[PDB]
Amino acid sequence: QGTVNWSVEDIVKGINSNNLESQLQATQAARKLLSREKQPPIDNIIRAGLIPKFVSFLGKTDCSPIQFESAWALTNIASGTSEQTKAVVDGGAIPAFISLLASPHAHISEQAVWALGNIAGDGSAFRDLVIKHGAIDPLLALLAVPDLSTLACGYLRNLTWTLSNLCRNKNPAPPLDAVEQILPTLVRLLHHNDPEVLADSCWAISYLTDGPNERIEMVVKKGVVPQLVKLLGATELPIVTPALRAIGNIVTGTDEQTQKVIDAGALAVFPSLLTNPKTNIQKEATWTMSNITAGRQDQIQQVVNHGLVPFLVGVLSKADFKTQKEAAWAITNYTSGGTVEQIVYLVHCGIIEPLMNLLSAKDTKIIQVILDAISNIFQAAEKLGETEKLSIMIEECGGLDKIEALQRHENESVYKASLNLIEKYFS
Amino acid sequence: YRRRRRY
């Protein structure tokens, strides 16, 4: 096969000949160039003025191979910078690719799915432009099968991916009714048994849940929460990561929505998520915990009965800083909504020492966060007449020095909190 | 995962 390594000017020559075959051959040369690992000459291809020509080949139904080669060619240009994508879009590729969705040749519509995927992936505008040109109907149609197993592995992977991009980006979020239209198929995909369909399904859902409550509610209302929780316990990190994000998003919404996650059994996975070797899982799991401890006392209670407080204490005691920061918050949140008993309980789990050690971190934000929390804790200890035994505690682990040296920390609300705390509990 | 190139 000597359509290998052509020069651009050669590709041009051919595509301009009035010879459908010569053109087919050159377009394949074009694809091959663009498929190379080391810096495919996308720019010069664009610069050569080729995009419109490829675009018009998409429409050549007699000559399927050219349809495919040009499809692939544009697919690859469309995968580069935004500007590269913009060039594909400016050529009129979008309705052309949509038309190809119904091509009788699977390998061709797959290419069309792929390209629409890249275009929608550029960002919200292209995404909604794909949507306006009516891509969503024909995509869904290819998934209109009694059993998803009967479709080819990488064909379904591509559709799942493209679909996820139609759910991706946020300013603005995708159109509500486009989401309504996608959801049922997404749900059906969230249940399929390919690790890769599951990862992308999870992302799709994670994107759609990253907004205001009404959005979360669309999702939660299709009852995917049980199924998200299950996935949360998967062995494949490519699946845990996006599932955990979905759940993390959902618990930012109403307490009602939060409770769906609790009922689903979510909390049971946390012992292991809060100890996970992958740094980011831990950060994200901890964050999620912070949004649960931000809920009602009976929700705080469920965190307690799953024995997650030790896990928080653990995370406060040793994790990379960014996780410890979330633990800090999770605790403050806890100490805000919590009952007296519950705040007591936290201290009996040994929350005071590891909290104190963090006061010497040089991150201004977290210190406030911790001090609000100490504040909060003394408050429950006042209601019990125990501000003493607690002060003593904070002394014996060197917390007292750390706060008492903190009136001379620059920040305003900082030195006032410490000031207050010192005055109020320490003389 | 934004965008994908082929082969």
From Swiss-Prot, chain A:
Its main location: cytoplasm. Residues 245-333 are annotated as: NLS binding site (minor). GO terms for biological process: entry of viral genome into host nucleus through nuclear pore complex via importin; positive regulation of viral life cycle; postsynapse to nucleus signaling pathway; protein import into nucleus. Keywords: Acetylation, Cytoplasm, Nucleus, Phosphoprotein, Protein transport, Repeat, Transport, Ubl conjugation. Ubiquitinated. Deubiquitinated by USP22; leading to stabilization and increased activity. One of its GO terms (cellular component) is cytosol. Residues 72-168 are annotated as: NLS binding site (major). It is found in: Cytoplasm; Nucleus. ARM repeats lie at residues 1-41, 42-81, 82-123, 130-174, 176-212, 213-252, 255-294, 297-339, 340-386, 387-426. Slightly detected in brain but not in cerebellum and skeletal muscle, highly expressed in testis and spleen. GO terms for molecular function: DNA-binding transcription factor binding; nuclear import signal receptor activity. Belongs to the importin alpha family. Heterodimer; with KPNB1. Component of a complex containing CSE1L, RAN and KPNA2. Interacts directly with CSE1L. Interacts with PLAG1. Interacts with APEX1 (via N-terminus). Interacts with FRG1 (via N-terminus). Interacts with ARL4A, CTNNBL1 and NBN. Interacts with ANP32E. Interacts with SNAI1 (via zinc fingers). Interacts with SNAI2 (via zinc fingers). Interacts with BAG6. Interacts with AIFM2; this interaction likely mediates the translocation of AIFM2 into the nucleus upon oxidative stress. Interacts with RSL1D1. Consists of an N-terminal hydrophilic region, a hydrophobic central region composed of 10 repeats, and a short hydrophilic C-terminus. The N-terminal hydrophilic region contains the importin beta binding domain (IBB domain), which is sufficient for binding importin beta and essential for nuclear protein import. The IBB domain is thought to act as an intrasteric autoregulatory sequence by interacting with the internal autoinhibitory NLS. Binding of KPNB1 probably overlaps the internal NLS and contributes to a high affinity for cytoplasmic NLS-containing cargo substrates. After dissociation of the importin/substrate complex in the nucleus the internal autohibitory NLS contributes to a low affinity for nuclear NLS-containing proteins. Functions in nuclear protein import as an adapter protein for nuclear receptor KPNB1. Binds specifically and directly to substrates containing either a simple or bipartite NLS motif. Docking of the importin/substrate complex to the nuclear pore complex (NPC) is mediated by KPNB1 through binding to nucleoporin FxFG repeats and the complex is subsequently translocated through the pore by an energy requiring, Ran-dependent mechanism. This is Importin subunit alpha-1. The lineage of its organism: Eukaryota, Metazoa, Chordata, Craniata, Vertebrata.
